[PDB]
Design a binder for this molecule. Structure first.
Ligand code: T90
Ligand code: MN
Ligand code: MN
Lengths: 401, 556
């Protein structure tokens, strides 16, 4: 019922981010949402003496039809004084993990009055017909990195009756989300989390289901054929040459030896027994892990995505080139690439939160202007990661195909 | 005394660590000093300013300038220093409303609320920093000390605080008159409705009564300006809008400054005038920023400017927006990376027009450019009308399907239909996904000596065909492209090409149909002529068959 001192980082002012255009239906949804928040004291109108701004938009959360307000606090999050949540390494090892939205608990906690000015946002008007409707927050805002930090004191006390009733459950908080993991059978997992809901009720309706996949890093696979054409062997040598940047003893000499001469690409080449031995030794090398692959919490996570076609997307997460920490494949709108990419980004970010407790920086196979025009139309999560754009087609797409 | 309502005060601060201004009052003539004393005395009895004493250490210079054609001095308080040290505000007018976004309305009335700028109180704690001195005659007595009680003309915060005050005043009137729209712009209130003129003027009279609650006087019916409204460079008529007359400069010795000023004027005209072209006029400003030198022009720039002066000959107008009709956007390819579009709801009655020029770059194609134009028109339409328009595009549905399913990037355009208006956007070649059976296989390679810039480009094939060409004034990248060009030149309609150039593959896999490199353009022209091309890549210096044979041929 009392506020906590919160400041910015030294030598930095509050955010001054431009509001981007919004459709009429999103503007009206935000007008209704913010009108009720104002009556409930959560936000208040502000005057021209507040020069700060943070973008706002509207989403329809997964499996729902009512609009939700999402504030892009990425710039304020970069500029807010850090608050010092040891990420549980056991969460990634649990059989199932459920994501519970608990963001509404923040609105019952007041925000430091001196800091409120920095949370300012603007509901834009169509065609600049009026100046925007300007608001600032009075309570902890959803999406601000300081909200889980400040509420962590209170959140710990709510969960302790549950955590000691179930020492086997792992609970982790990131932003507005609670991640709840156990090793139980799925039926007994649904029930115990419906039990966990009996706390925000006393002291919110939906949940997300997650299961770790077989491999943290998918193995590099080589074809198994009975007849190899010149083209097949050229593609194999290229993939082995690329993998030799990752794996130590990959040899291609005996396989390149088969390509001796100036042969048609479709001519069948019998493999010699030395070449078949080299290929066989390469297979065994590729089934070992990569040497010297460790997570450093001080360094950023990088995620690259490749469009493979037919709704298939490959990705790799790393900190150092050729030292992949995780790789994967996202599959299955059969007509909208951008919607697919936006869902892959959210799925990769959720996996990154579970494993390392932070979001990666994306390298997106898309032009900036196309992505910035459309990604908000399909976004469904309350956090937003960072991203950059790839404008030159990487040769690497083949090697994960 | 009918009690007038007070206007809320906006809290104002100076910038952090900064303090108020202290600028010397410059020597003024006795003629000017007498004029400033009379002006400030009437303002004092009006409550706008008040005398202060020597306790206030801040000062802002005051000047006197004669209003031209008038024998009347006017006061000017140079707030340029206090502005540098006043806090930042949420500023006025993030963007400019576009006339095409106005909804069709029966009547619109303008009220002049200029009498209200000096009827808004200034923050009491901030008045100290608006101090100024009227120097005495012959400088023999202390100067007359004054401070402001209202928003001063020229102070940094006056525009924003004035509009925020009007917005609060106007809020209960808008809510209790939902059928009334009001747009404020400086000292003007544009009040519109769809009421018949009798009920409209009644509502206007109620607004005038509502403004008097705060002691705000407005012009009565006889003194209100009439359509057309001249506003932000537009002419607004009851049913049509256009731009204000675009006047060009007519010199035969051009400079870089005025060519900067007229490209912005041709761009200004392009929002309603169709076919405005500025490409050849804009490529004269290439990296030369001295604003006082001359340069003639080409046989195609005056051909595009012969009509630019001739397009502005007959006035064209846009219409206003009917939210009950569909919003349609149609795009045409103009050639040379230029694109034009029209936004309309009924045929041949445009809401507005515009153009799009391709982004700078080495290689491009028409589908990417059309995609970019679509995204630009989408964002612009969200701003102006709050919705994405339906698109009519000069590209076949099958062409677009083939493009986005095979393109290595994710891409998307919103709901659209094909319109058969040549020239059509098309894919000019499509590489194969598998090697071609029966087609000759060309192993190409190029290499260049970095010092002498001498190099070689060549191929060997599975049928024993070979070529090596020596090159001067070339690089490794150029020899690798030249090698591919040779194979394309010397093969049949179907051909497999094996290269080790990651550079060449990265260019070709981006699917350009036009390039600023004439070598890439010649490759593109060859690709257009072929029926099937399969392009394979192998790593260099690994003894790959054919590739190792041609490698020793071109690096010698
Ligand atoms: C400068 O004029 C502006 C500018 C902006 C606005 C906004 C954003 O509402 C209104 C106006 C008032 S004009 C206006 N407002 N709506 C329409 C239609 N019009 C055009 C018109 C002109 C004269 C008579 C009748 C209709
Ligand atoms: Mn080469
Ligand atoms: Mn070579």
């Amino acid at each position: 019922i009392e506020t906590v001192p919160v400041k910015l980082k030294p030598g930095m002012d509050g955010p001054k981010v431009k509001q981007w255009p919004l459709t009429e239906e999103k503007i009206k949804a935000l007008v209704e949402i913010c009108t009720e928040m104002e009556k409930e004291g959560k936000i208040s109108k502000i005057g021209p003496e507040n020069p700060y701004n943070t973008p706002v938009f509207a989403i329809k959360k997964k499996d729902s039809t009512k609009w939700r307000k999402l504030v892009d606090f990425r710039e304020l999050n970069k500029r807010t004084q850090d608050f010092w949540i040891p990420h549980p390494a056991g969460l990634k090892k649990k059989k199932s993990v459920t994501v519970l939205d608990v963001g509404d608990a923040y609105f019952s906690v007041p925000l430091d009055e001196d800091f409120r000015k920095y949370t300012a946002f603007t509901i834009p008007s169509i065609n600049n017909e009026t100046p925007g409707i300007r608001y600032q927050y009075n309570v902890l805002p959803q999406g601000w990195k300081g909200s889980p930090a400040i509420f962590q004191s209170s959140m710990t006390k709510i969960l302790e009756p549950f955590k000691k009733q179930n020492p086997d459950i792992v609970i982790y908080q990131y932003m507005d989300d609670l991640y709840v993991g156990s090793d139980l059978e799925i039926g007994q997992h649904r029930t115990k989390i419906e039990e966990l809901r009996q706390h925000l009720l006393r002291w919110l309706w939906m949940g997300y289901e997650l299961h770790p996949d077989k491999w943290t890093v998918q193995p590099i696979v080589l074809p198994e054929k009975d007849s190899w054409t010149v083209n097949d062997i050229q593609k194999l040598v290229g993939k082995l040459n690329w993998a030799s940047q990752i794996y130590p003893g990959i040899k291609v000499r005996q396989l390149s030896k088969l390509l001796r001469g100036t042969k048609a690409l479709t001519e069948v080449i019998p493999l010699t027994e030395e070449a078949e031995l080299e290929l066989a030794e390469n297979r065994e090398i590729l089934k070992e892990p990569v040497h010297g692959v460790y997570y450093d919490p001080s360094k950023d996570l990088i995620a690259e995505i490749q469009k493979q076609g037919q709704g298939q997307w490959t990705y790799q997460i790393y900190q150092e080139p050729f030292k992949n920490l995780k790789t994967g494949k996202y599959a299955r709108a059969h007509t909208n690439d951008v919607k697919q990419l936006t869902e892959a980004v959210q799925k990769i970010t959720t996996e990154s939160i579970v494993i390392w407790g932070k979001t990666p920086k994306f390298k997106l196979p898309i032009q900036k202007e196309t992505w910035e025009t459309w990604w908000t139309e399909y976004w469904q999560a309350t956090w937003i990661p960072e991203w950059e754009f790839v404008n030159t087609p990487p040769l690497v797409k083949l090697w994960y195909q | 005394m009918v009690p007038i309502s007070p206007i809320e005060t906006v809290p104002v601060k100076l910038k952090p660590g900064m303090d108020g201004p202290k600028v010397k009052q410059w020597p003024l003539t006795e003629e000017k000093i007498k004029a400033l004393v009379e002006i400030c005395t009437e303002m004092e009895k009006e409550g706008k300013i008040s005398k202060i004493g020597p306790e206030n250490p801040y000062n802002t210079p005051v000047f006197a300038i004669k209003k031209k054609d008038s024998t009347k001095w006017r006061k000017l308080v140079d707030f340029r220093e206090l502005n540098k040290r006043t806090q930042d505000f949420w500023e006025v007018q993030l963007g400019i409303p576009h006339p095409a976004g106005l909804k069709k309305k029966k009547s619109v009335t303008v009220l002049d609320v200029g009498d209200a700028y000096f009827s808004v109180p200034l923050d009491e704690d901030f008045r100290k920093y608006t101090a100024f001195t009227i120097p005495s005659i012959n400088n023999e007595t202390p100067g007359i000390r004054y401070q402001y009680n209202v928003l001063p003309q020229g102070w940094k915060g006056s525009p924003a605080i004035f509009q925020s005050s009007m917005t609060k005043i106007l809020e209960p009137f808008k809510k209790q008159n939902p059928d009334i729209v009001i747009y404020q712009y400086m000292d003007d209130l544009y009040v519109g409705s769809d009421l018949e003129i009798g009920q409209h003027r009644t509502k206007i009279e109620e607004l005038r009564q509502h403004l008097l609650r705060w002691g705000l006087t407005t012009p009565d019916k006889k003194h209100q300006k009439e359509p057309p409204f001249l506003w932000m460079g537009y002419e607004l008529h009851p049913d049509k809008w256009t731009v204000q007359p675009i006047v060009l400069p007519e010199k035969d010795s051009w400079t870089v400054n005025d060519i900067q000023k007229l490209v912005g004027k041709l761009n200004w005209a392009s929002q309603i005038y169709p076919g405005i072209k500025v490409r050849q006029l804009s490529k004269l400003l290439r990296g030369t920023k001295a604003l006082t030198e001359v340069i003639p022009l080409t046989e195609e720039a005056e051909l595009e400017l012969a009509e630019n002066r001739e397009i502005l000959k007959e006035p064209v107008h846009g219409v206003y927006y009917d939210p009950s009709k569909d919003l349609i956007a149609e795009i045409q390819k103009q050639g040379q990376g230029q694109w034009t579009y029209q936004i309309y709801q009924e045929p041949f009655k445009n809401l507005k027009t515009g153009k799009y020029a391709r982004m700078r770059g080495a290689h491009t194609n028409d589908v990417k450019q059309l995609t970019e134009a679509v995204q630009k028109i989408t964002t612009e339409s969200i701003v102006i009308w709050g919705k994405t328009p339906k698109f009519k595009l000069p590209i076949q549905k099958e062409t677009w399907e083939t493009w986005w399913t095979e393109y290595w990037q994710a891409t998307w355009i919103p709901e659209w239909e094909f319109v058969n208006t040549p020239p059509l956007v098309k894919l000019w070649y499509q590489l194969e996904k598998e090697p071609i059976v029966g087609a000759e296989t060309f192993y190409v390679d190029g290499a260049a000596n970095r010092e002498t810039k001498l190099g070689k480009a060549g191929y060997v094939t599975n049928k024993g065909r070979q070529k090596v060409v020596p090159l001067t004034n070339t690089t490794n990248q150029k020899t690798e492209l030249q090698a591919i060009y040779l194979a394309l030149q010397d093969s049949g309609l179907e051909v497999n090409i094996v290269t080790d150039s990651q550079y060449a593959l990265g260019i070709i896999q981006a699917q350009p149909d036009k390039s600023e490199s004439e070598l890439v353009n010649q490759i593109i022209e060859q690709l257009i002529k072929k029926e099937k091309v399969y392009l394979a890549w192998v790593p260099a210096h690994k003894g790959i068959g054919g590739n190792e044979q041609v490698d020793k041929l071109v690096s010698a």
